[PDB]
Amino acid sequence: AQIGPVTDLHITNANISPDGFSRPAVLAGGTFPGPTIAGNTGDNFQITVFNDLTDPSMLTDTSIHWHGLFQKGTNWADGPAFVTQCPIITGQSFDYNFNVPGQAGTFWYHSHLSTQYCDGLRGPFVVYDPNDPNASLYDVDDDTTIITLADWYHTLAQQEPIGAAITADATLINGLGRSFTNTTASPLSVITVQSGKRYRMRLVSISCDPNYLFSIDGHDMTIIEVDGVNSQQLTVDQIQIFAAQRYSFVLNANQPVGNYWIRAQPNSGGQGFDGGINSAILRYEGATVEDPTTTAPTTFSNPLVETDLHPLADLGVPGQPFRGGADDPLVLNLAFANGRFSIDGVSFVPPTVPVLLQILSGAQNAQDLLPAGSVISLPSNSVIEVALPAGAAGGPHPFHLHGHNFAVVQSANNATPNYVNPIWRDTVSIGGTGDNVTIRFTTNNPGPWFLHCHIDWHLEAGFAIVFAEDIPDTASANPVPQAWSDLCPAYDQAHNIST
Ligand SMILES: *[C@@H]1O[C@H](CO)[C@@H](O[C@@H]2O[C@H](CO)[C@@H](O[C@@H]3O[C@H](CO)[C@@H](O)[C@H](O)[C@@H]3O)[C@H](O)[C@H]2NC(C)=O)[C@H](O)[C@H]1NC(C)=O
Numbered sequence: 001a002q003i004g005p006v007t008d009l010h011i012t013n014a015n016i017s018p019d020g021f022s023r024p025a026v027l028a029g030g031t032f033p034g035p036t037i038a039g040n041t042g043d044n045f046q047i048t049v050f051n052d053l054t055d056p057s058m059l060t061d062t063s064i065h066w067h068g069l070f071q072k073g074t075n076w077a078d079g080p081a082f083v084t085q086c087p088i089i090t091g092q093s094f095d096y097n098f099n100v101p102g103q104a105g106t107f108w109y110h111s112h113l114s115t116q117y118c119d120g121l122r123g124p125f126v127v128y129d130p131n132d133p134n135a136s137l138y139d140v141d142d143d144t145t146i147i148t149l150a151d152w153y154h155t156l157a158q159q160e161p162i163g164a165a166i167t168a169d170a171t172l173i174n175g176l177g178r179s180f181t182n183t184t185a186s187p188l189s190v191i192t193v194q195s196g197k198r199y200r201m202r203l204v205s206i207s208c209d210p211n212y213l214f215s216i217d218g219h220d221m222t223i224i225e226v227d228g229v230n231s232q233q234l235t236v237d238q239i240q241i242f243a244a245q246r247y248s249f250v251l252n253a254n255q256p257v258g259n260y261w262i263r264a265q266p267n268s269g270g271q272g273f274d275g276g277i278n279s280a281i282l283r284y285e286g287a288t289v290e291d292p293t294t295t296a297p298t299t300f301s302n303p304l305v306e307t308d309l310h311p312l313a314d315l316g317v318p319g320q321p322f323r324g325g326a327d328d329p330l331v332l333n334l335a336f337a338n339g340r341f342s343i344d345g346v347s348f349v350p351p352t353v354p355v356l357l358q359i360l361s362g363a364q365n366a367q368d369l370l371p372a373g374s375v376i377s378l379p380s381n382s383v384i385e386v387a388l389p390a391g392a393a394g395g396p397h398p399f400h401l402h403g404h405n406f407a408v409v410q411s412a413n414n415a416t417p418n419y420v421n422p423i424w425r426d427t428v429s430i431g432g433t434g435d436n437v438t439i440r441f442t443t444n445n446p447g448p449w450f451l452h453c454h455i456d457w458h459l460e461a462g463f464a465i466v467f468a469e470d471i472p473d474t475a476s477a478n479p480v481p482q483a484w485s486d487l488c489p490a491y492d493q494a495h496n497i498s499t
Pocket residue numbers: 323324330331387389434435436438
């Protein structure tokens with residue numbers, strides 16, 4: 001069952017074996033992935049997170065981010081450790097109490113401390129629309145139509161070298177899949193459909209790193225939502241989905257009753273499908289209970305290309321129709337060397353006092369804020385442009401901005417900008433060498449918003465900066481509850497930190 005919008009959520013350690021190999025994990029709600037948190041657009045969510053963690057090998061502190069929700073007026077509830085809060089300590093709990101005005105779509109939640117979400121703390125978060133403009137395009141939209149894609153590691157995250165190219169041991173679809181080495185015929189996930197019905201499949205990348213080539217043998221997929229943003233219908237036969245992105249697509253159960261492979265090929269780790277790796281099963285009601293015999297094509301004739309996507313609403317693009325045509329035009333220097341990433345010459349290392357608390361304590365400008373050189377101020381009520389030129393090792397890097405979505409003015413692998421009708425989203429591949437992926441948004445949400453690569457290993461190695469949006473209005477805009485003001489004293493006391 002789905003939980004929320006008002007719910008407790010316990011964070012525990014347990015052994016799991018999603019690919020047949022047993023390892024300890026960090027779990028929300030006792031499962032991998034965690035339970036779906038759900039509500040309707042505009043609802044008040046109050047998720048009281050109980051930190052019950054005791055295994056130090058995966059960290060006993062935690063903090064949870066609600067990925068893609070803007071948190072307007074509730075920056076304190078956003079979750080990134082040392083940006084908007086100190087972590088929750090073990091044996092304590094914290095109510096993330098926020099509202100979701102003006103958003104409806106497919107999201108997710110995950111740990112936002114260190115690389116802890118890799119160890120298991122990841123699940124879906126869906127905000128339904130009772131008046132959804134796409135409602136007439138399908139029959140079924142519920143917990144059975146969510147499809148998660150996850151990387152899974154046999155080595156615990158805190159034992160992964162920083163700045164290394166770390167590789168997974170299994171792809172998991174809806175929590176199940178097979179190991180790339182020492183493969184055993186462990187259970188595969190089954191997605192069940194009824195011949196003739198149309199399904200809103202909500203495809204969620206909960207990846208810590210790889211991108212997936214996602215397809216379903218015999219079927220095509222009609223995209224109607226991108227990272228929470230309704231799209232015009234776009235029919236494709238393959239979706240390359242980068243870490244943390246989401247799509248809704250219509251699946252028409254219009255093929256002969258039978259079994260069909262669902263495929264998710266990562267860019268690293270095991271290649272192909274031998275032994276049923278990288279696979280799940282689409283089963284029609286009435287089909288025999290047996291594995292599919294279907295084949296992938298050698299090439300996919302209608303792959304998703306990001307420039308083909310357009311918003312359903314007339315969203316346009318803020319600013320002027322040329323490079324630098326914004327109130328605050330930025331170009332970030334994104335680099336990697338010797339195990340560490342940097343942005344504008346500075347590698348991100350989390351500060352001792354969270355950025356929001358520094359601002360609430362009176363810090364007057366981005367040069368007063370720590371980490372030095374890791375915080376850029378943005379002016380209020382202004383069009384921001386951010387060019388993100390690729391090249392840094394370990395690509396393609398999916399960049400994500402907290403507190404906002406954005407127009408994708410220029411996409412990967414295509415030098416032509418679009419100032420008319422590009423898709424809006426919240427996580428974007430910046431492409432390959434020589435690309436100049438560029439985003440735009442307007443600043444109507446005061447607070448410190450993290451901008452970072454969403455390959456979690458890269459974030460840990462410093463590939464991040466903080467946009468301190470409208471510093472002057474941050475305190476008046478984001479009143480903080482006593483439970484939030486209690487978090488840093490408790491955390492620093494527990495860890496013997498002075499501040
Ligand atoms: C990606 O697009 C951005 C614009 O969105 C490009 O930024 C432009 O970069 C050039 C140099 O690469 C800048 O010109 C330089 O300015 C300094 C003075 O600040 C001057 O000393 C240099 O001789 C040169 O004029 C320009 O300001 C900046 N912005 C623009 C044109 O709007 C960026 O180059 C693009 N990157 C790639 C890889 O395509």
